Design a binder for this molecule. Sequence first.
Ligand SMILES: *Cc1c(COP(=O)(O)O)cnc(C)c1O
Ligand SMILES: O=P(O)(O)OC[C@H](O)CO
Ligand SMILES: O=P(O)(O)OC[C@H](O)CO
Ligand code: NA
Ligand code: NA
Ligand code: NA
Lengths: 245, 261, 383, 383
Amino acid sequence: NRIAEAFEELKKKGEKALIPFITAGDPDLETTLELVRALVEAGADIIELGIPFSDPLADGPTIQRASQRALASGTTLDKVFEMVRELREKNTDVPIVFLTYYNPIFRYGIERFVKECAEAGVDGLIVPDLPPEEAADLAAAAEKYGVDLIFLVAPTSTDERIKMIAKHASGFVYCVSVTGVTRIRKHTDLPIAVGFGISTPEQAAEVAQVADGVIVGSAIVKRIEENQDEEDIVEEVREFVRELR
Amino acid sequence: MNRIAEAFEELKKKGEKALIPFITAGDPDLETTLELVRALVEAGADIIELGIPFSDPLADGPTIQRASQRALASGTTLDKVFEMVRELREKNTDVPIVFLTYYNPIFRYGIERFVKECAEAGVDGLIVPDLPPEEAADLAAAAEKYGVDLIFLVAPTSTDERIKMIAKHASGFVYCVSVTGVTGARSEISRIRKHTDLPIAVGFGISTPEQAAEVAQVADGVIVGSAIVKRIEENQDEEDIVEEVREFVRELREAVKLEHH
Amino acid sequence: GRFGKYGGQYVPETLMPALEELEEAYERAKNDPEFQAELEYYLRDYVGRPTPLYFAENLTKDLGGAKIYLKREDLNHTGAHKINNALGQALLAKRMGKKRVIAETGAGQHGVATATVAAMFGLECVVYMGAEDIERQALNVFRMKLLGAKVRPVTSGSRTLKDAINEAMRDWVTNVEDTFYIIGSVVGPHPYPMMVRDFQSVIGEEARQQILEKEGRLPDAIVACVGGGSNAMGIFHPFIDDESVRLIGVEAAGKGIETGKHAATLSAGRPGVLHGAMTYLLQDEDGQIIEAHSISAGLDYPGVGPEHAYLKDTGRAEYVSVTDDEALEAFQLLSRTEGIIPALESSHAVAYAMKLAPELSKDQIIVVNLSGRGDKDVNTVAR
Amino acid sequence: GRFGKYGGQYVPETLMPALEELEEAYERAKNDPEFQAELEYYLRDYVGRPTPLYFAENLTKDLGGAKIYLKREDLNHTGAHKINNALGQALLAKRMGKKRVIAETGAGQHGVATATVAAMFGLECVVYMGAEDIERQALNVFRMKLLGAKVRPVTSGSRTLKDAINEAMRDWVTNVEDTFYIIGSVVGPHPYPMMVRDFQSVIGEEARQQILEKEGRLPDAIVACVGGGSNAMGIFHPFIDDESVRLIGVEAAGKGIETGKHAATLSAGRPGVLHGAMTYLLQDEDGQIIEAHSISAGLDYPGVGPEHAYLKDTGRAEYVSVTDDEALEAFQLLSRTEGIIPALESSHAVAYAMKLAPELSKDQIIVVNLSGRGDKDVNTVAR
Ligand SMILES: *Cc1c(COP(=O)(O)O)cnc(C)c1O
Ligand SMILES: O=P(O)(O)OC[C@H](O)CO
Ligand SMILES: O=P(O)(O)OC[C@H](O)CO
Ligand code: NA
Ligand code: NA
Ligand code: NA
């Protein structure tokens, strides 16, 4: 898997992963793809693309507003898959992770969704509202096509729950740094990336010093929203991310 | 003897029937009432009922309800109708005057104080529509003390027992209610209330000379109110209210008499 | 039909035969077990009685004195005690072979109650309502029409409750063959004060048994708002003989007695005759009936039941008043401390209980009659 | 937490600790005689239970078929069944030492019920409400504030019920240590569908005992309206094992399913995940949640309780729908025939029983869950 290959190359250099998240289709899908290319250029190791959902139960103000703008521009699953294929026409390198809520998966059709994942070139999935217990049919589909399922672990998660999320994780385990919305760290084998709340270069290197990767979303989305359409947006996102590098 | 008794006795000796107009005092104002009373006498009225306006006249149809509301907005009070009756008595000591008043103005005024003022002003009789004999003990003793007649109503649904009891306390005349209902000019129509020898007058609904004539053949007197009050209300508005009332009541006077053959 | 010097039958002779027929009819029904069993059936399955007696624990703690119990007449079908009386009178109408019932209403609560039982019993229903009250109670007028009643606006006189009662009386005397007049309070000629009080005594009969079971003592005081007086008489009557139980009726002082704009018949009226009863009345110096004034239209009858006149004069019951401002504050306090939105009428009782509770010990008990729910008054309070 | 293939806990990992504590707290309370005796106490004295089971004689005769009984949930304090559930969850919150309860509301009925029991229990209360719903429900917003709750507008997403639930879940996860999330229907993640059903089962437990005493036999059919499904589960559950009792849930077809603007989740929706439950759902081609449209807002939840999805697929319950015009006709018929003004939600059940009763024999029996009173809808119906 691209994800597996990427954490391996980082550790050979003793490096940590920078994992930007942006919402696909915000402000539109043509800007998303220029953004993904600029995140690549600024040194992103793994790109998470938020699939906009009308009910982001796990997202704070920033990313909820981004999803809402993205749905107003017509963003759909198939449109994001087409953008990824375009990206794969050149950047066959950078791993792509889809962050999506389960009902769009389920309505699209699980088996079909994962197959379309493998064909487009999406390497990992993050389904915020699908715990391992209910994730069997998705896990069976994803295991067939070699798409990783990234499960989240929270500070309030029991030890028993950490162990069970560990036995079902693939690619990396996503450590939510605060019981809220948008050790701890330990201790099964996979890469551990820490997310939620990180919004300054100080904090991000602070998280870098503890985990294998840092996930940054709202901080970047904020700059997408504030940059009045000029773009600008790309240049602001690029310089902010370079600093996070 | 009470003016009411004198009036009925004189008509009896003449072979005639009492015409008893009712108007609301103070509608449209008390000066006009005075003028109306004088007109009514000149038109042949034998007894005059003056309605003391009340804010909740339980027994009156819409016509007299409206007259009462007008009379009350023009400031009519018991004391003011008394003064009008005294102005009346300055020049006319003959005509019997009856106050038709609900009980609460009488109560409140003071029962004995009210009957005393009746006797001094020159009011000969009382009609109290919401006061049955069983509640009239106080007013009846004051009336008897001061020679003021208390006229009680008998309705078509009153039982022979209730009539006996009514006629036992009645004086002046017995008011026979032609209809089980409220005042108001109607178009239609025995009693025959002789457990008493008092004169019997019939009222409620009598609106035309033809109806007044029909009533005059069976009773000692005929009471007409709503139909006269209509003529006051409908002018509308020159004090020529007087001519219309005078003209109507002259028709009623020619009608209230024993029929010819 | 007399409560001391009060009460009586001050009606025109055209109505006396109808009253005799009614008192004899009621006398038979009173003592007929089939009638009482049929009434109890409908009180239970249709109205929803018994209503609970609820310990207002937050309020009790807030005020720091006596225990506060609320008699929850706000839980009856239609939201007020009125239906207890409309139900009994409509059942009697059917027993007398009357196809048609009429009622007066001021704020519309009795009119809704009457239309409600008329619909259930299949009776024709006409409600008289002064036009000033129609203009202020659009929603209650629409409820009455939904329930199938005709609303006859009364534009005569002062266009409010007293004039609606006059017109209903006129209708009754004219149509007595087929019509029963369901009076809305413990007012009017005998036997209506007696009869309405009996149909509402279910309130105090439940309350008496409930407090003994809950607390093992009788109340130190029972507090009820008083307009015409029917909810108060309903909870007072079964405690009349319990000499240790204070009976406190609360009238509307409006802006203040001293302003003249109030509805405090017992505290500021004087004796007189209205609508068939000798009682206390708000009236002017010429004996003309005056309009009552309150933030709650339900307390607007210028008279009061002759039986309260008697209880005031003998001193068995004590009558006090609270202003609009005090009723409003109680309305708000009860809502936020117990989650019960009371009628602005009943808020007057809650307001006086708030004055009295801190002045009693924690072992003592006040029962407040919660005569209705205040959903209807939420717009008024917002204004 | 599973009803066949439906139910479960489709929630982020950050919510899983809160749900496990809630699961265990409720499982203990469910079996705790003291919790149950307390809940019964407040249902009795505060809510007014039991509600009567009322034989609608006029309606029965007018429809010409089965006997029609109304389970009178309109008589609860606050005028609907919701308080049964709000009371139980708030009592659980209080006994857990929680200081704060939160709730979502669409039309404000659950928000009112929640603010009401929070006021009575002395809990801080916050109700999340979409801004579009706030602008259509000024009266209920005002009442919630009178009851001492804070109303938090949700101007994110589509600014309606869907979005208030998400904000409320977001508040809950952030403040779990002192906040209890009172969900308003039999929806969401385990254990809420089961727990809300359990708190509402008092409806069916009373109805079963009442119908046995009134007819010596179980009903031939129970009819209830279904939005999220809580009033239906409460009356259905105690009859599930009585195979001789048909269970009929009635959804809102609005202007007609063919128009699209409807709230018929079971009849026209398809399986999906919403708010933590696998159930039937109104959703677009991309799995985006759609909003539902009906004359009665109380029926606009885009999903339905997973237990009804289970009952529908196993055929234990049959789900139908009636249109806006049909509910309106039933709203009017019951008012004029029984003097009961039903909620527009409930008149969907009346509307269907109006169709079923003629088809049925005279000796047969239908129980209609009258889930709420219609005073709140009188303004809507006139327009
Ligand atoms: C009408 C009403 C009153 C006043 O009438 P009474 O005869 O004095 O009881 C009081 N409370 C409520 C809720 C009312 O609807
Ligand atoms: O930076 P946050 O707090 O928005 O969280 C990380 C992104 O949401 C991607 O998971
Ligand atoms: O003619 P009526 O119908 O107004 O009745 C007679 C007077 O009103 C009363 O004497
Ligand atoms: Na009064
Ligand atoms: Na009950
Ligand atoms: Na639904």
